[PDB]
């Protein structure tokens, strides 16, 4: 396999190409390995930032909201994430 930080780098590479589907595949794998206790410099909040935006681009609306809530729970001063949460809660009438 690839390491947690390698998979994260793969997902960031896909994201910077505008390839949101492959961003999802890689970041989901990161989350799996982080939850398996694997050592990594990458934090969950950083993964959720890419993943929440990518799943929104793919049309997965309530999951984007769920992941944005989880991101803010782990990084409360993340101003961009707070703006995203306001957007998704207004979009989905979940305020």
């Amino acid at each position: 396999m690839l390491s947690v930080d390698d998979c994260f780098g793969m997902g960031r590479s896909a994201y910077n190409e505008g390839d949101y589907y492959h961003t999802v595949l890689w970041m989901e794998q990161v989350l799996k390995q982080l939850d398996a206790g694997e050592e990594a410099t990458t934090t969950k909040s950083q993964v959720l930032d890419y993943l929440s935006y990518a799943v929104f681009q793919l049309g997965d609306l309530h999951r984007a909201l769920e992941l944005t809530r989880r991101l803010l729970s782990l990084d409360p001063s993340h101003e961009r994430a707070g703006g995203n949460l306001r957007y998704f809660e207004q979009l989905l009438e979940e305020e």
Partner: peptide, 9 residues
């Protein structure tokens, strides 16, 4: 437009 913003890079 009105929408979320992802990581800049």
């Amino acid at each position: 437009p009105p929408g979320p913003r992802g990581p800049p890079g």
